[PDB]
Amino acid sequence: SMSYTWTGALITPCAAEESKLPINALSNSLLRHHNMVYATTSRSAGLRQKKVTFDRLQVLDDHYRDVLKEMKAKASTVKAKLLSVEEACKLTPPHSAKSKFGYGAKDVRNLSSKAVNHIHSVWKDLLEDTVTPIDTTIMAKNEVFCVQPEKGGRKPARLIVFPDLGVRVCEKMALYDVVSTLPQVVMGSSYGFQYSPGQRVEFLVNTWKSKKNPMGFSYDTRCFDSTVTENDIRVEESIYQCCDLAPEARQAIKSLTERLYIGGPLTNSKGQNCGYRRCRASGVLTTSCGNTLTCYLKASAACRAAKLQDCTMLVNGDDLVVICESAGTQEDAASLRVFTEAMTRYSAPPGDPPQPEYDLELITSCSSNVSVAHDASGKRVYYLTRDPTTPLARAAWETARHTPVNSWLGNIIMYAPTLWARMILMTHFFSILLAQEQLEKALDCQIYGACYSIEPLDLPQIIERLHGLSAFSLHSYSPGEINRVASCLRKLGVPPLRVWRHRARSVRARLLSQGGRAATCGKYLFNWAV
Amino acid sequence: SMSYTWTGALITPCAAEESKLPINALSNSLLRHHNMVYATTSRSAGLRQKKVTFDRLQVLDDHYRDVLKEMKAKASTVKAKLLSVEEACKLTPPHSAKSKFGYGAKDVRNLSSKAVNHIHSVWKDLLEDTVTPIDTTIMAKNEVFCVQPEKGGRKPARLIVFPDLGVRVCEKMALYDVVSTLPQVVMGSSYGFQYSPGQRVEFLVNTWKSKKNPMGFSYDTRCFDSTVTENDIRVEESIYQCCDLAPEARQAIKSLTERLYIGGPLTNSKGQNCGYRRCRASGVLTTSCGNTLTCYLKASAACRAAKLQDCTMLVNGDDLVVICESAGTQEDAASLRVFTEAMTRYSAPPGDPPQPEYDLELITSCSSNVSVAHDASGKRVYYLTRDPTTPLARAAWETARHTPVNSWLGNIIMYAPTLWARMILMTHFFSILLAQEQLEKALDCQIYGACYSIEPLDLPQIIERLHGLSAFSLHSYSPGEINRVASCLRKLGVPPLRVWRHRARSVRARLLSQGGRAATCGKYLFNWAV
């Protein structure tokens, strides 16, 4: 069936949508080719609609059926509980869209009688009505990127579809305990969300080294959420039901699947009907868990169809990496084509055709890749890195326009061991913090699904806990990594690494001069510049 | 061993401790004998120390051993998970004592890097050190009561013992999922915390009616927390371990038991060592679950020792109610004495000797009792009520001194069907809200462990959901109930029920005049006054 059917009404914004990077001095200090940085807006919604709208034809075979039975057997060992209204309220994120029913996320978190009474009413309706399609709002996402001339230049905005806040809290009551435990049990070491960057690296490196002659590939499904069929969503519900659940949870899971997850009406910010969805909604509680289970099921089956040898998979939602034993250059190329044809039959066609890789560093998944450097004693230390283009463009944007969200700080934390986060991001931002006497002001930081209130002076301790002390002494980075960073700097017009090393010595000196926690930042975060 | 051993250092306050009800006009409108209302303070801590300090001698027998094996078998069917630091932070109550380590409950709830880093460090220490006693603070509680001349007049302050905020969050990581599920599985219908007031009434009434010749009694253990022995606390840990838990959770449960739950050093608000505890701490996560399991285990065994017939128990922490088949007047009296002797052997001696009751209304447990009234159609409606002395004294106190906590509102909600909450509390407070134009201002309200932000206009919907529509039309209350309320009014100097009916007609008229939600309050909450 068609992933979407549209009416003609437009996907409208609900506030000011800025698309251009403002000519600012502080930002230009970091990046000069400002015209290459842009943000998506509702203006490009039409383009996105075209690419996410298509007919899905799905043909399953015994490989798929066998994997699904194996998964259900594992799911049958899971026990999960219903969350109470109060627990679901307390776990509601601080800045989610307010309800159309008169209350917002703050009221939910504070257990206001208005929110609590309304949620009880939504829950009761979920149990008593298992068919009426539930309303969802469709919006174009506003995200910052760097133009890619070698392609369509600017990419169109992603479309997010989500139900009202009251329903969102009810989804947690029914499924929070399921989505936070089921994938791990069913997929074991293949469940990517259980890993921190270093633990992800550890699993990838140990897996790579375990093969006699390793071969690996990333698989990029074209518009994954759109490829998810009704059958896929009902298969997900059948896996959830294998768990030992409370009677009300079963009834609510079934109702949410029928009324919301399989599809339903799309309403714009103006209240007009935009169309109908028959694929995955990006904004429901089960999007992550559902996509991970479905990707794992389809890929597991496709590995069997392709007779790939001793496969080990790593799955994060729609992102997939497979490492296996190589059967030879042309054998591998042929087997990957068979793998792709199976994925295509299962309704997960590729965006870019997958390619066999024999160098672990060249495999990119979750926009990241493993790389190697050396610690103080010269020992090899593997770590997770990524192309710094998007992180830098966003850092420049946030430097120019105050942002309730500080992605740059999230990048400094998640990519602390990297050459670019250490030399460019840390230097640039601490320079600013010192100049504005804001070294002690906490900043909101979105990382791994949660919004933290982070004090810059806590960075040393945060990095040590997440990455270990070696993150402060890594050196002798790989040539591929050094070259990628250097190229990105040229492309973006950001000063070369020598300019940053110089700027960092100044920053470090300034930190040491203050002693205390500030000195600690100077000692550990900038030990590399000395 | 001794429940406590003291040093001589005093239990000190940490702020202003008011003990007298201030002569105020608004409050005097409700209650005139203001000198009968008082609040406990650290001044009486010594008296409380005397009563909670004693040697425990415990002798177990096969009845106890058999019940414990039965309990472990049920516990073995429970699976529970570890909460992450972030989940435990989000479930931390908004107003708990700040940490000695530089952050408070707001920082925890907001995932501040300072709180998060510290908690990770406390957790790591729990896993790596399983012996060092953990520090706890001892404080005298400040609570409001009405003098009881027939006894010691004013009761001494209760003593609360609790670990630092960081440890408290770690207790949730290890045990939140266990304490919220294990008791229900082990004890079934006997677990009192699964019931709302009406559901508690339903279980008690159906149980009472199921007996050929019902007999029941409440059992009040003298200073229960002090009677809990080291063996009892280790028995609790052994039950927790029967659950299917994560390896880290097992290690943390064991460490918390050894370092904190079995006992440890007591520090006052001034930092001085006050003594050592070898019994239950009132302020740990496991106090409720632990007390409930232990009370249930000891009482189950004691029912067997006393050969009580077809017993059905209801347990809420240290509060216990038993309903059984009567064996005759003197047979019952004898059997209860045997029951008490068994409880005493198990280290749960009575405060007041239990007495057999053959009238369900006369059994008080959890400071409450079942009573009967009639609905619109004249049908019998059972509901939960209680002596209104404490609720009224507190309502008077809160009327005189603004209080971040509005217990009166919690009482209006929990006891909405009662004659006193409807005629006195609702009338008095809505009268005030109307006069101060605060009918639409939300108020903080502590109910069932959570702090809600309640809007008065939401009361009708709250009461309907919790008690049903009949709560707005109950009439023809029992003579025992009417007499108890009337007597309390005399004792306290609060105007008789006729004065309240008159005042309510005015309040109702004023509400109706406004229409909208206010009119709804007038129609439902005061329909009785017409």
Ligand SMILES: Nc1nc2c(ncn2[C@@H]2O[C@H](COP(=O)(O)OP(=O)(O)OP(=O)(O)O)[C@@H](O)[C@H]2O)c(=O)[nH]1
């Ligand atoms: N602040 C600063 N910017 C620099 C410095 N060196 C280079 N840049 C900037 O970094 C970018 C260099 O990118 P390239 O494309 O390699 O430029 P180039 O090779 O210097 O070319 P020309 O400018 O024509 O000499 C430009 O935006 C420069 O302005 C430096 O020492 N300080």
Ligand SMILES: Nc1nc2c(ncn2[C@@H]2O[C@H](COP(=O)(O)OP(=O)(O)OP(=O)(O)O)[C@@H](O)[C@H]2O)c(=O)[nH]1
């Ligand atoms: N506001 C108000 N208070 C009343 C009214 N009737 C009685 N009270 C108060 O309620 C209490 C009555 O308690 P009792 O001990 O029964 O007093 P009593 O029987 O009236 O005794 P006397 O005052 O000596 O006639 C006193 O505090 C009275 O002031 C009334 O109509 N209005």
Ligand SMILES: [Mn+2]
């Ligand atoms: Mn994709």
Ligand SMILES: [Mn+2]
């Ligand atoms: Mn992807």
Ligand SMILES: [Mn+2]
């Ligand atoms: Mn007691």
Ligand SMILES: [Mn+2]
């Ligand atoms: Mn009690």
